[PDB]
């Protein structure tokens, strides 16, 4: 699936399931006809396990465990800071790539 | 976290008909020089891209992939550009470069 599909918006993670504050992280995910998949996770925070993405096709919510994190130094207007990058469990090297692609190709 | 930066080269159908800048170089850093991971040009027919070469110790021929096609819009209207990996270019970087070409240029 081509790489115009893959965008961006914040949503919510959490150290556990059931812990997931709203909108604390970015989310990299692909949009197609009706719903969406999400692929990795960006966060100011490092102990994060759990994903909460809008259900596709639907009203509600996924959750999803994550990868152990990516850790990344950003340069900032205040100066670097560092965040983390979670890939969705399992993901293949290409949508990897894509992701890693484009947060190389955004920022820094 | 690696940082993909574009130039442009030389390519062409044919070893010797590679003659001078018809194409775009998405290329690496490497620790010594520069790393090329596709190309991107309005040109269908190319299968081999001219690189010098820091030193200048002469020059690399690198073999390419048969294209994709992605429209692109511009200012003067859409034109469409076809995306060249090397020849036994890894997942990971295709994913890499497509990433990145969804950042540099205006797909759809």
């Known amino acids: 699936l081509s790489p115009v599909a893959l965008r961006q918006m914040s949503c919510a993670a959490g150290t ?5 504050t709203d909108d604390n992280a970015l989310a990299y995910y692909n949009t197609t006809k009706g719903g969406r998949f999400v692929l ?9 396990k759990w994903a909460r993405f809008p259900k596709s096709d639907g009203t509600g919510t996924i959750y999803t465990e994550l990868e152990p994190p990516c850790r990344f130094v ?3 207007p205040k100066g670097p800071k560092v965040k983390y990058l979670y890939f969705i469990k399992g993901l293949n090297n ?15």
């Open 16 to 20: 556990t399931q059931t812990a997931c």
């Open 40 to 48: 990795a996770l960006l966060s100011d925070l490092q102990d994060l």
């Open 74 to 76: 950003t340069d900032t």
């Open 94 to 108: 290409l949508n990897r790539g894509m992701v890693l692609g484009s947060l190389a190709a955004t920022v820094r």
